[model samples]
Target: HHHHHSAMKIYLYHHCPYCIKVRLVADLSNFDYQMIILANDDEKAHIDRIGSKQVPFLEKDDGTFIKESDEICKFIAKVQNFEIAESTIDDFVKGCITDLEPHYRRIIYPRIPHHPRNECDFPTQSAKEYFINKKSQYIGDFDALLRNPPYDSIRAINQILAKIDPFIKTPFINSEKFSWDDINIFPIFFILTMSKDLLEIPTNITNYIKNIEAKTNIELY
Candidate 1:
């Protein structure tokens, strides 16, 4: 049987990429932390605690909270004795994400609120609207973006994937050991799974996703 302490808590949104980042570290390290999924409409809960509508808040055993996903990951890794791999490709990964983000947001932002997961987050109509409204401010109208999907951006992502596929080393990114680079890049691939219909992710990348999912026990789809 598995046993975990009841001390640490993580507030999450099921489909949030940042939340996925934090979850991967905790899961991979076998860190004992409670996971709490907050609805899209529940801004007050976050604001009341951390003064922002952010997810993947790691509330520690001492009743303090870690607000950012990177912070949480680093903290958990240290406490759990997990190694943080040397960051060789973080800059390249960041660049790829930057190039892919605007288009990626247009595609995935519309789908997540409606995706059929247990912790879908935007289950209520008001919750869905809150999500749509919040995202619309950044990505523009969801309906418009859906009707006129960014074909150019999709093509660019295909090209980007082709470039990234070879950089991915077996069982990890650029290393035999799972490192920060894997953590940095895996969530992007995890979210990209949601866009399979719109764009083709190479088998190498998909295989990487499956491998990391198996290792970390986090379901990407």
Candidate 2:
């Protein structure tokens, strides 16, 4: 569906990384949209109306609905007739895991301040402890990857991060040009940076962070 207006409206929550991914996707795509940041407590009802319990849901002007960050990004790219990066079967699988792992680590395990905790509240102290233990285990695996490259585990994660670093620097994936891949992975990097102290990203990763933050979007945020 198309709206007479130039923009689409997005229902999202600011603190949700899933929502952040959609927002970043919209920004990179140069799509104009209004964001209705849903309250944490109200999300269940809101999601129920949308027929899903997920944040970062999209509503097109044509009265269509979309969820799942990658799916939503690809759908938007298709609708706008933008040039999206083609993914191989391998790429698709890798993308799926790359997009998911950080959210699990940073949100599910590390207990970042913004993620959901308890049955309904934002992260609690117990949640933080739970995340800390989980994060420690997760990082052990990541650290192994850093020490050894060329494995599927390391390569996939690195490639995704490389693309993301530049966008953070320029605030647009593909720099002046944009791509859906950029939108797909922005939130992973955002949360990684949010836990800089705990993660202790290497010097090289730190440099990458510096470059990405140089971009206007990050500066504004």
**Best candidate per TM-score, number?**
1
Model 1 vs. true fold: TM: 0.91
Best by lDDT: 1
Q: In model 2, how many backbone clashes occur?
A: 4
Structural similarity to truth (TM-score) of each candidate: 0.91, 0.55
lDDT of 1: 0.80
Q: Looking at model 2, report the run of 10 residues with the lowest lDDT sum.
A: 114-123
Task: Give the per-residue lDDT digits (tens) of candidate 2, residues 1-221.
Answer: 33322266777655466776666545545566776655444546565658765677788878888877777777766675656654222354345546748444432233343343222323345534443444566454443433343245334445555543322423343444444444444455555564343333444445443554453133212
| Candidate 1 lDDT, 49-133, residue by residue in tens | 8899888898887888898888988998998888988788746656776788777887777777777763468768889888888
